[PDB]
Design an enzyme around this catalytic site. Sequence first.
Site, short mmCIF file in Angstrom:
data_model
loop_
_atom_site.label_atom_id
_atom_site.label_comp_id
_atom_site.label_asym_id
_atom_site.label_seq_id
_atom_site.Cartn_x
_atom_site.Cartn_y
_atom_site.Cartn_z
N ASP A 189 -10.20 7.63 -12.99
CA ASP A 189 -9.77 6.24 -13.19
C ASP A 189 -10.92 5.26 -13.42
O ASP A 189 -10.70 4.05 -13.47
CB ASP A 189 -8.93 5.77 -12.01
CG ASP A 189 -9.74 5.59 -10.72
OD1 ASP A 189 -9.32 4.78 -9.86
OD2 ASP A 189 -10.78 6.26 -10.57
N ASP A 201 -11.40 13.58 -10.36
CA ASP A 201 -12.23 12.61 -9.65
C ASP A 201 -11.66 12.24 -8.27
O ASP A 201 -10.51 11.84 -8.16
CB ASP A 201 -12.35 11.35 -10.50
N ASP A 246 -11.70 9.58 -6.26
CA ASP A 246 -11.83 8.14 -6.06
C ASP A 246 -10.40 7.60 -5.94
O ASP A 246 -9.57 8.24 -5.29
CB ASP A 246 -12.62 7.49 -7.20
CG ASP A 246 -12.19 7.96 -8.59
OD1 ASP A 246 -12.98 7.79 -9.55
OD2 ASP A 246 -11.07 8.52 -8.73
#
Lengths: 345, 336
Positions: free
Chosen positions: A209, A14, A16
């Site tokens: 996360d 991911d 982010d």
Amino acid sequence: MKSIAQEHDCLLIDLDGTVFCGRQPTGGAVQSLSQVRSRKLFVTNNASRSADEVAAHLCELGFTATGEDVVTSAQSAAHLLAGQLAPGARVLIVGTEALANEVAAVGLRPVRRFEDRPDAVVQGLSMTTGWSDLAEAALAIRAGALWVAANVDPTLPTERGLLPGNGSMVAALRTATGMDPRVAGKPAPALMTEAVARGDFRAALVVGDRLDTDIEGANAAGLPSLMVLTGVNSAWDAVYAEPVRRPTYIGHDLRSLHQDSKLLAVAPQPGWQIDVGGGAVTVCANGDVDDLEFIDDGLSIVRAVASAVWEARPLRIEAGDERARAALQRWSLMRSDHPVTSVGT
Amino acid sequence: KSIAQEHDCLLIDLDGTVFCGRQPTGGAVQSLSQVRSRKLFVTNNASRSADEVAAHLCELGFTATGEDVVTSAQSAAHLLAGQLAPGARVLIVGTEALANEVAAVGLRPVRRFEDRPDAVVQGLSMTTGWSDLAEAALAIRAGALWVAANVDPTLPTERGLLPGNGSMVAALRTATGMDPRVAGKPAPALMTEAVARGDFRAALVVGDRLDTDIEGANAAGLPSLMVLTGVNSAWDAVYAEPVRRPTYIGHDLRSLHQDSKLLAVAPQPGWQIDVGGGAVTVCANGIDDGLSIVRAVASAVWEARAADLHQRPLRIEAGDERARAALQRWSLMRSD
Ligand SMILES: [Ca+2]
Ligand SMILES: [Ca+2]
Ligand SMILES: [Ca+2]
Ligand SMILES: [Cl-]
């Protein structure tokens, strides 16, 4: 004996807080991934930049990536529409040319206004999107256009602070129309299932996360997940997560990729005895007071408490001794709605 | 002695009441030319300057100047001036007309978060974009005072229902988790400011929209005349919740020259009403402009439903063929 990364032929990482901390990469990210031999696919719910543009920024930040390693929600949104619209059907684009190009690439005709007679609206973030663009979309939605959003994230994290995300621009249209879009990105499983199908991988692992995008997406896709605790509330959020948002593993950051998966798994832990009763989950330390044999990566208590809470209004986290007390507070798991900190902000 | 002659000044809503799109409402020009009380034209929009709104009125055949107009921009400005220190910086979302109303009360209009605003004011501009919203979102998150001209979800136009200020407000609410103070209708300050403008003792609100004009009037302690040329219907008035109930109902602005006793929502000699068994049932027996039955039915429903409790809607039924025809004219019955 083997690392969790070695147990998987590809990682869906991911983009982010997992990899970016605004300006710089997150502590330990570039070093850890440089030692991973399996395929590294970078997945983003952001539909504003092309795959190639995402890769170039990742490289700039010290990572190694090409466009072929990046999967975006622009791509999954285009596929979602192309799977239910006719060849050459018109789609009104709210968002960048990168989004428009993904629509064109799947045999559809990108379009910018209601009078061009779109059968659908696809919506992704663009920093030049304005009122007039939204007005065209609102007209199309009111006239029955299929409405797909790339994501519904309310905010966009940047250096300057938290700015309005695609979810904010969706909300304007929801207020204007009374309708909600279909979401093509995470938590929908398609993005991840498309990533896995790209290279025909057989043992994929999701790394992220966010419980409501990365982890839920993974569970929806039938893939195992590693959740990394980038935020102050990540540990608390994992512990109290609803079933569809529960990760398989919990790690501190991307150093966890080189730890043993058995150590990372949410499960009972040798260092912690847990007593569930009377509305509370009470945690006690196991060894003698000066015994350090159970201290590993520091997260064993979170795994313990999460595991006890998952196997069954919300239970109270409580300490049965000094060591549990300190270890719970290290992870902000002792709250009266917010953990007391030494200095207030 | 008409209803207009019973009032110091009239607070007249614009769209739906004075005009509908391109055309003045039926008999509006002649009716307003013959009222001698003060006519203030009142709009929830903060995009256009008071002079621009007056210019539009003139173009439709209503003589008006900037001073005859009351906008949400002006109300927003006043609200800001009451909360902020003089010279305080205010980040503008919306047009230059809004920015100027803020300057006019001694505040400093600004466009960027780096200009260190103490407040954000938000009105519609057709050129507002993501970058403008980003600046305001930063200010709002950092604790800036947030005022919205209105919270209307849509803006009606020739081409359809487009996104209104309320839609743009919704974007910022989602981005920030915060909520604005609302300056326009139905917050009463817009109207109670308008009466101060001339120190009037007996103002009347005239409008078409229950959730702004009429709700606003009631919050302001002012009586209200609903016209039926705009958004809301006779049905809507009958079933209006207590806070959105008007004092009088008329077809259009020609009603300003009818007797207030004739216009009032209240029992009527011509129509006998029995409330019971889950129905309001109406019979004929025994001036009428055609709205007599609606005033009768609304009065009965309102009297039976004093408070906004989630109660079963009373059904409206006829006890004879006379009442049936008149009720059907206003779509007050249900069939299958
Ligand atoms: Ca070995
Ligand atoms: Ca150790
Ligand atoms: Ca109106
Ligand atoms: Cl406005």
